[PDB]
Amino acid sequence: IRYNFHPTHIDTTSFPFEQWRKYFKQTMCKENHRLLLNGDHQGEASFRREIAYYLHHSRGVNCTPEQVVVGAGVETLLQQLFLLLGESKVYGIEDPGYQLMRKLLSHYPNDYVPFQVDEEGIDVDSIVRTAVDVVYTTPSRHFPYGSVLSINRRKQLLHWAEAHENRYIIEDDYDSEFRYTGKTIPSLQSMDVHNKVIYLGAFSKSLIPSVRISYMVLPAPLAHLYKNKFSYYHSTVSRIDQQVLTAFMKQGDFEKHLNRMRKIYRRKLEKVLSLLKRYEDKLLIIGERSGLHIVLVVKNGMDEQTLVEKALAAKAKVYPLSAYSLERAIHPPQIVLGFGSIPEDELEEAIATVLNAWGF
Amino acid sequence: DTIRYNFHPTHIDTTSFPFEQWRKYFKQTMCKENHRLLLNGDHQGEASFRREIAYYLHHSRGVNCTPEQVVVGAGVETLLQQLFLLLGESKVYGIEDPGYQLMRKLLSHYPNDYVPFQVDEEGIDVDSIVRTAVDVVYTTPSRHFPYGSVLSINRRKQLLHWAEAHENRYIIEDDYDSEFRYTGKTIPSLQSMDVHNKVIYLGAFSKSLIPSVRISYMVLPAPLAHLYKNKFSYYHSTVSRIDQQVLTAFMKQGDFEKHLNRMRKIYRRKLEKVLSLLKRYEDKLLIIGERSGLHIVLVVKNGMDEQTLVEKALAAKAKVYPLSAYSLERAIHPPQIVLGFGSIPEDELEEAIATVLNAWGF
């Protein structure tokens, strides 16, 4: 309550309401009644022929609107994939990451194998010397430190899968065009030519979290397996919330929302680092100056379960780094702050009362 | 596909939803005072969209429950796959025949095993189930595809003690269709007749309201709501915080029950028009289950096979749906065909039925 530094939220008071309302009135009007009965089972092609036009001009992704699949959430976007694969597979999760591929697979007979990371990337040699079949990396930005995979590891990891023809690799975006200097690199979907990596996108940190649209992109000989095996399903996103975001990205008002949103977070990043570079005796920063959240490491010798529970007395919650890693971390207790939803004209009191609560 | 004169048993009429009363509540919720409602709140739905269903269904269909036991979802299949893993992999699942073509095909991705039954004019073959080894069976109390055979009251009190015999058995009910029967409105729900918690409730706002709002509630009993919140505490919802907080104010301040009664009378006015027109022939076309809801089944005693009859209606660009799909086995030497009217408008019914009849050789 009252101060919630969530690690991946968004700011509340800045999305355009009165611009969002106008594109509804071409969608649900008195001629429009064939937008009521249920259409195609994976979103209307006016929503996918624009996604294939957008990700070829902003992230270097190469895809066609008969292969991209829409869905809702990620947990419903992933559960149809585990049954599509089979049940003779052994998964790959990086050691601190998003707590998602693990927490699903507590229901299925499969097994997940961790793999170590560093400030250059994740390990690739242990990917070689085991028998893993599906691995899950975020090549644009590594949660939650902020590491970026180089080109030196990408050729090795993509060439690991080409020699034996039954392994896969899942890219999770989580954030792009929020870098403040430009688009990072062309993503790992761009460098594939043998159709071995699947995408997994999002529409929920960029624009609005609670509209529950998302998307993956399938490769060539798996798209006509998913369409063959699940041709008796239904779509999951409400079709009046899809032709909103067809004209929204045919007539160009998303490509002026994210560019507008960039500076509203950069102006928070500079005013949060100009408050933390005074107390540089202990509160070190690990990870780059990008994204929506910082990772302060506290060398002041208090314990983590006291450090989080100390902030709750003055109606403020932070998010620790015990639940994000399987093993137990170093003696300096890392703590993840965020700056998405805290507004600008209360940052210099928010961080002040947090660091006043901990130690002056 | 896109076609003219589509006759589907779920395609509701499109030209009678109060667009203005859809938009007066939609414009009310996106205000500057009404942020805190664009990020993610609760996961089983908004905490008032669940409070309101427990005073909609309680006095419109009879179900006694609490808003701590409700589960919202999306579709109904995403509401079923978050049940198929709450029970185990030691169960066997009982479907009807004929029925909806869902829970046969959904159970082909799993190691669970299903066994069919038969359906008579009193309901389902309840006498077969007591001497068979099934563990969860899925039935439709208040109606039945594709006939209309309401469950007779003796078999309901039999199938109560069926699932109240042991400890590991459950039953599902599927009352997709209610408040759309002409008089004696609907027999009250199988959830109401149970007082020992072995039946789960399952129904949806996508036949009444709009085909693509994609909301389906669910009710849970006490020893599965607790077991769902525990082993599913890390999901989110699958419907928005605007598609729910429209229908909270859409139902709090009146304009749902007026739509209910208006759509209740419109479809009776549609049905009697069909019963007037098709009665002029009873030579080869007997009609079964003439009374209820949104679809009739229309037999045919043509001197040729049933396969030619569905594809002959494509010759004049019309769509009809046979009954060799809703059943496992195929021995229908009387050719059965189900039809619908719920999408066709009144002004072209006269040409419409004459298209398919004289397309069949009249």
Added chain:
DNA sequence: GACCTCATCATTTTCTTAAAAACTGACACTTACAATGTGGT
């Protein structure tokens, strides 16, 4: 022989403000399909 702090320059897509324009809020009217009490033999 290296790293990295301020300008101030021309092209440009965001930002409050302003004066003509489709519209819905709260009356009253104001008919139409049809619910329920008082009579036909």
Added chain:
DNA sequence: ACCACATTGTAAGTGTCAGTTTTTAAGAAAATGATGAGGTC
């Protein structure tokens, strides 16, 4: 006791007046790129 006929009681039919609402376009305007000025080490 067996077989109807008509009142008040409202869901509807366009319009009233006004009001809190939507749509087009032009200067300043905050602020991004090729060029030109120092510092530290």
